[PDB]
């Protein structure tokens, strides 16, 4: 199970936050601060996985952006390390040469992409082909 997906930058500004279990605001907040305190301090000599509370966090930096997926401990690391990646690849196709800004000024459609590829804590679509085909069929929508 995926517990949450974060996208926050080198300073910890969250720029996407899909949660997959019930949390309060006060919780969601502390959580976002913690995911920062942990991911931001790791220097690539380290590995892409960390014990995080009772779960773990897969994550890869892309420019100033940390893409974090929190998962159950028994979850397949490489699986979720590439999910993150092909999700980014879809974003870069939807937005063409995507960057932090697209994800801010367009935050509201970031979520429709995310939920196309992940829903209810599980992976949904993997096929960049179909997920793009759909994102482009919407958008033609009134």
């Amino acid at each position: 199970m995926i517990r949450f997906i974060l996208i926050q930058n080198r300073a910890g500004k969250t720029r996407l936050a899909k949660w997959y279990m019930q949390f309060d605001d006060d919780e969601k907040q502390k959580l976002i601060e913690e995911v920062h305190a942990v991911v931001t301090v790791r220097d690539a000599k380290h590995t892409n996985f960390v014990e995080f509370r009772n779960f773990k966090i897969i994550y890869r930096r892309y420019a100033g952006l940390y893409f974090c997926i929190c998962v159950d401990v028994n979850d397949n690391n490489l699986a979720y390390l590439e999910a993150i990646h092909n999700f980014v690849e879809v974003l870069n196709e939807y937005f063409h040469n995507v960057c932090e800004l697209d994800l801010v000024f367009n935050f509201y459609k970031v979520y429709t992409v995310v939920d196309e590829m992940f829903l209810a804590g599980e992976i949904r679509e993997t096929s960049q082909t179909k997920v793009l085909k759909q994102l482009l069929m919407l958008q033609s929508l009134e």
């Binding site: 892309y62 974003l91 995507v98 960057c99 800004l101």
Partner: peptide, 9 residues
């Protein structure tokens, strides 16, 4: 910190 850098390429 210049948030316009591409995430890929």
């Amino acid at each position: 910190m210049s948030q316009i850098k591409r995430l890929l390429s």
